[PDB]
Design a protein around this ligand. Structure first.
Ligand code: NA
Ligand code: NA
Ligand code: NA
Ligand code: NA
Ligand code: NA
Ligand code: NA
Lengths: 599, 599, 599
């Protein structure tokens, strides 16, 4: 029984000490080691070859120990490994095997969860180098990778990227690359103090399902001019999403390169999150080059109930093609978001927009197939000095987008730069229930509120309603002569428009088209015949051959006569109405009319 | 001290080994067994009568062991039992006592939580039989059952129903029947691989409170033609709800029988979820037969921010009565949802709808009391071939429903089949801010976009606004002669309507009613008197005794004369206006007019 | 080796029993005590000075033991202390040191989380006294307090305030005072059975960040007439919020004093929650006295997707000033909420409102700077008897608020009491897409639906659209003569208005202003000249010098003549139009017209 003492102090000691839960006679007779075996931590693998525990710290590379933990638990069919609180665990080398191709540090495995309670930091070994901290691929070539299933990272802990800048723009950096990922998630974790490309990526070219980021924080993850691009969470598998997250950047470079979320496959969502200091809110794009796993269509895309202060564009819609695949984007909803462009000089960052219809990465504007988008019940505000702010910058072909019950307070409502791209536009619908704010009133000299710089516009509705005066603007809406316009409805409500010289402008007289339905205010000079009694008044100009009716928006300050209340036209392009001369005499008046065509 | 060795290897050994937390002198001097007693797992009860641990597996019935665990922890005032990861735990027999009446396997108890990390599977013993895996009732008769309080099921684990079909349609199958359930929840769990009636039910005929399903997954839970009906989560207690869940079906039968969520009591919600492959999204119904615990009214019902691909109806509203109780439904909000009918043949599944006002289970349409419903900021799409798709199928009495700022792209906006039910309709409001999509343009031969096949319509608003042409439709809106119409506003905007032969149709000339307020386009033939100068034009037809004013929607291609810009009527039903003959002569013209009555 | 037995039974025994995880030869050789040291509970500190464990209960004050636990774990860099299930832990004395100034019981520390699984109760020592159960300040003076970081309270447990009433109204009571709090949260916990001021407060006069309350329950937390005021969660730091919570009160006093949530700093939110029995839903206010930590502006404020039954006001907007600081409120969104005033007598609780623009605490109405607010896609209902119910009670200066696509069913749409405050109103926008319900129809004798009792109104839009008749109302909208009105648009749709004697009323003839744009129905008497043929009709009254056009809303029951379809005016204030006498004769008619000015 020296033997006994010896057994007890050995590593098998706890397997010799009996235990029965709460002294319950119906409970299993076990050994202490069995109960301790119900949980597992990094401390169970963070040892030297003699089995002595090693303390973590800035001069200890914890990577091989965490790997051994994950490998072992994997072997038993899964479990959760805790990364203990009250310690910082440094990683100091790359991983080996399948994740080496991805610059991987740690390889994730199916059914093995990590509960990160303490902090994981990157050591300076990784300064100026690429890295992907957690990698769910098992092969250098992702196309020959197996899947990562049922892997969850959660807890109150922290992944800190050590503040190192990128060494070259062509490098990639990631926190969690889940890979071909099914039922994987990240919950509760703070990712901070980096220059990276993404914090988390979900899926790989459409392969994956049911991947989620929830209640995480992403802080200061861009810090250098070297960083080519950033999207904090990249969602590349369907039935996946980001909710209730917090995203914050403080670097100037983030204002030009960083986006909070990229949704790239069907049935994906971005909800309930707060963003500050980023260039962009979310990309919603079907890339043909990423369509292998879930088809060529991004549909059922939701961006809802977010709060953002950004410097560029809130939501960016896109689709593109490759030699063998064509991407399509449809069935999108953007709702309940409250968004503002932060304080900045005009033109000092990418052009401010709530919605951008962007060209593809090669700058092409004639590849897109975006339709059935609903933008509703959102608020948007840009400070008065930011010339480059729009409800929508429509810079590439659009096959449909519907706006209802939004409140836009920025420089333009609809915009595209002239002499850039000439988008083909179908089914753009701007309902009268969109409220146009007044922050930019008096700033619009030389500018058109809806600046329709497109190749063509068809099956579209623009119902302009102002809610305060802005007599600085050139017009409420303007179509250049190069824009064709057909089968559309364009109206300008008269409220706050009485002193405007131009309300709607059709530089190619496009409002005359057979299936164009318009109404807008204009000032018209009329002259009557001399006849006492019922008497016609006629416009002095002959520009009104397209008008179906017109009615007065002016009071009559005369006693001895009245001009017609309503007008029709004549073949020569004059307006004509019947007024009344109590006393005879040729009359001459200037009257503000509502001009109507087919409405 | 042989005695000592003996004690140590006994089940009481760990109660003899001292422990003090982190060697802290101010900490409690305890024994190892005390610390191990702070947690509990199934392994502590999964033993034979000699106390030897039994390994789970396909030929071990784990049921009695889990029951013993729950019973014991219950006895101590609660706790959380872990079901360990890396194992599959099979259930192989029914439970006994109070849950036998409910085909129960395991009986839940108050304050005893289950942390399901591994997998629970059903053994073939249950093939072709009913079952309810977890049951919170303590009595065969639910009316004499006590309550289940503070019971939470959570973790990353799985409940797998083993793929067995129902044996007969009259059978029921459930995952979690919480019973008369207060402060109970299911979080994180995957329910899969079944033919069941429900995965989870919350409450019992209104008794319960604060029950929630969050972040769960429900996959492939209908698989046979035998299954009579399915609702994945049935919410039958108030102050309860489903959020951020995922629901997926792949069976053809699911497309005809399955609904994701049923909300059956007040202050219930269904939010932030994704649905694919189901017939229906949510039932929102006050059943009089289920009104004992929380009253006869379902109010404060929320369906928001969901994503769905379904084959039948997205939200189904209802209420019914019994001999002693009348159910009422009011104060409902349906918002922010993006929903589509999946690819399918017309008529191949239940009639496609965003909203359905359904008859009761016996098919009665004259019992319902549904009002104060708001449907707003939703998107809906059905593929062009699906004739059987509507924004709303109004098949039973309706006391109110309001639509604002939605985007509906399907075959019908408002529909009910003729010669079926004749609903009595009050307070149906279709605001002008609803955008009508164009996917079904050219498919509407013989059909009315708003097909008002009701007994009567009162206090209703239908403001039709098209956003593209569809000249295939018979009319935009049609009331048959059997539909009474009063104290209502019906308008058709002229945009895209110029070539339509019929815009609004009142087969019983209902637009003449004293408190009917209408406007719509029509083509009218007029003839003038020969008089030079101001001259009247009169309609050749006498169908316009109800018109209060009309105005031109046509240009005047003549020089020598103009027709009136505006018209009123005369007792004989002619229109009359004053135009102008520059030169005398009887004129005859066909003009497109906006007809107005009291607007 | 008596020595060995002795060591083993000592507190260091477990540090002598070897363990190696799952017998894995590559795992660390540790001792049992090392694995037990990975977790910590209250039981590790709940002992007498001899180290004997003390059982909790009503006659044990657990406070010093919990404090020792938190202090010790703090010393190691953090961790999570469990408060065990199956026990109730009573607190019975105040804490000492820095939290004594705040009436603190327990002092929270950074990185130390509490997992509350059992119940924490207050002992009667605290009856009639102030208390703040958990306090994150480390100093009596909060301005000299350090921060509380990374502190999370979570679990399925309960904080029960023991039902004690306040002893005096000047006392404060709190559950969790996080203090200057950064990355702190409360999840899953039930707070119940009290008379307190707040359950949880986040931040201190703007200092803090990333504080959240989620999935908590707050039940019956006001119970006496002594309680001065209550806000269940007070959010006083930015980037912070409340989601998916449940709030319930049953006391009469709660209906007059209690609010569920107070949002007091920028980038804060209140979402997805259910409220019942409270006076108020949420305060959204920038208090100048609380602007030290995060600036003078509350912006990015979100209240969305809540469900509420309240007795007073749902959302209350405010801002105020101090001698050195001016508070501002802007960029607010209120969306998707479904709210009702519970059953109560008129005037029996604070005035019912969806939105209230409230004066400051000293009652001043001329300090506020509230603008860029969007209220959209909400539902509101008050029972027909509650005279004191409004969509918005506008009781203090307003610099902007926009309403779109809401459904309001209550007594008033816009209200302020006369002869109280005279608010200055700018940029109030009431879009036509707001649906006005009919519950209060026939109850509005002597009342104006939009009762514009303000000093002035500018840059505002009120588009009234009824959806049923209410001939009991005095008018749809009324401006008293003391209200100036300019640069505004005020319209009343004619639907359901044909029998109204007054539609819009301008008691000071304000609709004549140069930049006022109006339209509304009126009945007008006209008389014609005797001339056969085209013939003028003139109004008998001369009140129409402001009218720019008018058109008929009446049918013509005559054969021998027709009145004009449209009218203009003359300098003397008569209307004039040209009709037609088939046969000559002076005509005299009463016609319902739409009067238009500049629209
Ligand atoms: Na759309
Ligand atoms: Na062109
Ligand atoms: Na309604
Ligand atoms: Na009928
Ligand atoms: Na606004
Ligand atoms: Na005044």
């Amino acid at each position: 029984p020296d033997q006994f003492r010896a057994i007890i102090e050995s590593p098998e000691g706890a397997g010799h000490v009996g235990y029965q839960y709460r002294r319950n006679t119906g409970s299993t007779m076990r050994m202490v080691s069995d109960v301790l075996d119900e949980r597992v931590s990094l401390w169970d693998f963070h040892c030297d070859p003699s089995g002595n525990v090693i303390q973590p710290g800035p001069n200890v590379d914890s990577r091989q120990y965490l790997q051994a933990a994950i490998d072992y638990v994997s072997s038993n069919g899964g479990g959760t490994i805790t990364i203990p609180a009250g310690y910082t665990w440094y990683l100091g080398s790359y991983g080996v095997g399948g994740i080496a191709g991805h610059s991987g540090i740690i390889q994730l495995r199916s059914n093995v969860n990590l509960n990160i309670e303490g902090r994981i930091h990157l050591s300076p070994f990784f300064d100026l180098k690429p890295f992907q901290v957690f990698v769910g691929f098992d092969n250098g070539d992702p196309a020959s990778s197996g899947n990562l299933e049922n892997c969850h990272i959660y807890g109150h802990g922290v992944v800190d990227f050590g503040g190192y800048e990128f060494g070259a723009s062509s490098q990639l950096r990631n926190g969690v690359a889940f890979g071909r990922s099914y039922n994987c998630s990240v919950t509760g974790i703070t990712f901070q103090n980096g220059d990276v490309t993404w914090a988390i990526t979900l899926g790989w070219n459409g392969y994956g399902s049911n991947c989620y980021v929830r209640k995480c924080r992403f802080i200061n993850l861009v810090n250098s001019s070297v960083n080519a691009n950033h999207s904090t969470v990249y969602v590349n598998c369907p039935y996946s999403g980001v909710e209730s997250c917090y995203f914050s950047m403080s670097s100037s470079f983030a204002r030009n390169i960083a986006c909070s979320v990229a949704l790239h496959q069907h049935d994906t969502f971005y909800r309930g999150s707060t963003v500050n200091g980023y260039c962009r809110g979310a990309y919603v794009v079907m890339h043909a080059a990423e369509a292998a796993g879930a088809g060529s269509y991004a549909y059922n895309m939701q961006v809802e109930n977010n709060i953002a202060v950004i410097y560029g564009q809130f939501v960016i819609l896109g689709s593109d093609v490759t030699a063998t695949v064509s991407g399509h984007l449809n069935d999108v909803i953007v709702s309940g978001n409250i968004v503002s462009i932060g304080e900045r000089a005009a033109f000092s960052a990418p052009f401010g927009a709530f919605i951008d219809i962007g060209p593809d990465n090669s700058g092409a504007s004639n590849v897109q197939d975006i339709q059935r988008v609903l933008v509703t019940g959102n608020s948007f505000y840009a400070p008065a000095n930011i010339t480059d702010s729009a409800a929508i910058t429509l810079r590439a072909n659009l096959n449909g987008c519907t706006f209802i019950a939004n409140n836009f307070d920025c420089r333009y409502m609809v915009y595209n730069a002239p002499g850039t791209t000439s988008p083909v536009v179908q089914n753009l619908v701007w309902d009268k229930s969109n409220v146009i704010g007044g922050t930019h009133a008096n700033q619009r000299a030389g500018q058109n509120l809806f600046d329709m710089q497109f190749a063509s516009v068809v099956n579209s509705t623009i119902e302009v309603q102002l809610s305060c005066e802005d007599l600085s603007m050139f017009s409420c809406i303007l179509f250049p002569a190069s824009c064709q316009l057909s089968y559309s409805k364009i109206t300008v409500d008269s409220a706050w428009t009485k002193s405007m010289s131009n309300t709607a402008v059709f530089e190619g007289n496009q409002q005359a088209g057979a299936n164009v339905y318009v109404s807008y205010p204009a000032t018209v000079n009329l002259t009557s015949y001399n006849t006492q009694g019922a008497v016609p008044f006629f416009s002095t100009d002959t520009n009104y051959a397209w008008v179906t009716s017109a009615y007065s928006l002016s009071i009559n300050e005369n006693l001895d006569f009245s001009p017609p209340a309503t007008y029709t036209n004549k073949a020569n392009g004059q307006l004509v109405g019947v007024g009344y001369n109590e006393i005879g005499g040729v009359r001459s008046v200037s009257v503000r009319l509502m001009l109507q065509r087919q409405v």
